[PDB]
Each structure stands twice: as structure tokens, then as C-alpha cells.
Structure 1
Amino acid sequence: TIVVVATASESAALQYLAPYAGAAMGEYFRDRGEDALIIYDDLSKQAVAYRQISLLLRRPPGREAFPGDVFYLH
């Protein structure tokens, strides 16, 4: 296993980015012809970190104040 950590005190951008960093490590094995398995623990917390980032940038809030592009995020 590889463990990627972005704790509750990290900057919101490091929580938002952490799943893409994990995916970037999983793809290294995938593109070679090996099998990997990646667990994203709490995508809902990534969505809360991205909501915070998008609300501090004064972007138009959607439903439950989430930004419009949370689908295009996930």
C-alpha cells in the first residue's frame, strides 16, 4: 500500500488536491500494465474543502452553497 495523507488541519487546497495526487500515483502503475486499487476516503470532505475555496473566491454558490462545478470536480 501507499498512504496519502491530508489531515483536518491542512490548507483547504491540500485537501482539495489530495485525491488527484493519489490518482496520479495510481496511474503510474496503470499505464505500465499493472493493477492498482485507490481508496478515496471522504470525497465529501474534498467537496467541503472545494466549497470553502470557491466561497472565499466569491464564486456564485449553487445548491447547499456548493459551487456549480462540483460534478465536473468529481
Structure 2
Amino acid sequence: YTGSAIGQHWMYNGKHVLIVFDDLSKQADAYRAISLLLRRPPGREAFPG
């Protein structure tokens, strides 16, 4: 999201941006960790809804 916001600032000012996420599976794992630590009810593979 930080990278997306930095790119969006340029995007909304007529620039062309290329953003690479290496890699989103790690972000999903981190978000699952956060949700489980908050005791949010898990779903498939323990991922949040």
C-alpha cells in the first residue's frame, strides 16, 4: 500500500508508473498473521475472510 500510494501520487499527475510487488503471497501471510493475532475468525488455510 505504501508503494501503491507513492506510485499513485505520480499517476494522478500525468506520469506513467510501473509498480512491482515481490511478492503478494508474503503480504497475504503477514496479513493472516495479523488477523490471527487479533483473534479474527479464520477461513481457508487460516486466511482471513
Global fold match (TM > 0.5): yes
Aligned length: 49
TM-score (norm 2): 0.96
Q: Once the 2 structures are TM-superposed, how far is the Cα of residue 44 of structure 1 from its aligned partner? A: 0.3
Partner residue of 1:37? 18
Matches within 5 A, 1:1-74: 20-68=1-49
Structure 1: 5+ residue runs without aligned partners? 1-19, 69-74
Structure 2: 5+ residue runs without aligned partners? none
Whole-angstrom CA distance in 1 between matches of 2:5 and 2:29: 22
The answer to which structure, 1 or 2, has the higher relative contact order (CA under 8 A, 6+ apart) is: 1
TM-score (norm 1): 0.65
In terms of Rg, which structure is larger?
Answer: 2
**Cα RMSD for the two superposed structures:** 0.4
Runs of 4+ in 1 over 3 A off after TM superposition: none
Question: 1:16-50 CA distances to partner (integer Å, 9 max, x unpaired)?
Answer: xxxx0000000111000010100000100000000
